Amino acid sequence: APKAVLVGLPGSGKSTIGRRLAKALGVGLLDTDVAIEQRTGRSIADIFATDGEQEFRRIEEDVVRAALADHDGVLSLGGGAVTSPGVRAALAGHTVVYLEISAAEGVRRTGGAGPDRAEKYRALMAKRAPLYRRVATMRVDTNRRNPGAVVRHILSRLQ
């Protein structure tokens, strides 16, 4: 079981925090999006473009479940993993850290008719945030905090 399973959208600092948190615990960091390519030997764009989203999600759920069982460090979940009922079920009982950020603050930490970039990012956060809240055992705000301060915060909550 991972020491901590990290969830959050782009702009939340998941990557740095994940790296620093793992180092802080003297454990390893496993990112499922990366693990999906090691597994399949095919990029995410290729698994999607070739096999479709439903196949991609099947592969992702399988990679997550295996990670939840074989990885004992820090596990960083791909943003859409929680949209899978089976992934949400697999996370039951685990330590899940939601690196929470506001839609506006995420926009700021990203970037450079129909909807514009920010409107699209906003709509996605609205659909995902409720789900991150549902599986989280710990919600850590990263709207102002620096990576290092968020890590010290997580550590103070770890078993």
From Swiss-Prot:
Cofactor note: Binds 1 Mg(2+) ion per subunit.
Superkingdom of origin organism: Bacteria
Residues that hold substrate according to the record: 33, 57, 79, 128
Subunit structure comment from the entry: Monomer.
Disulfide bridge partners, by residue number: none
Gene that specifies this protein: aroK
GO biological process: one example: amino acid biosynthetic process
EC number: 2.7.1.71
UniProt xrefs under PROSITE patterns: SHIKIMATE_KINASE
Residues the entry annotates as binding ATP: 11-16, 145
Upper classification of the organism: Bacteria, Bacillati, Actinomycetota, Actinomycetes, Mycobacteriales
Catalyzed chemical reaction(s): shikimate + ATP = 3-phosphoshikimate + ADP + H(+)
Record's function text: Catalyzes the specific phosphorylation of the 3-hydroxyl group of shikimic acid using ATP as a cosubstrate.
Binding of Mg(2+), residues: 15
Protein name as annotated: Shikimate kinase
UniProt KW keywords: Amino-acid biosynthesis, Aromatic amino acid biosynthesis, ATP-binding, Cytoplasm, Kinase, Magnesium, Metal-binding, Nucleotide-binding, Transferase
Family, as annotated: Belongs to the shikimate kinase family.
One GO cellular component, as annotated: cytosol
CDD domains: SK
GO MF term list: ATP binding; magnesium ion binding; shikimate kinase activity
Pathway per the UniProt entry: Metabolic intermediate biosynthesis; chorismate biosynthesis; chorismate from D-erythrose 4-phosphate and phosphoenolpyruvate: step 5/7
Localization per record: Cytoplasm
Domain statement: Consists of three domains: the CORE domain which forms the binding site for nucleotides, the LID domain which closes over the active site upon ATP or shikimate binding, and the substrate-binding domain which functions to recognize and bind shikimate.
Principal EC category: transferase
Keyword Amino-acid biosynthesis attributed: yes
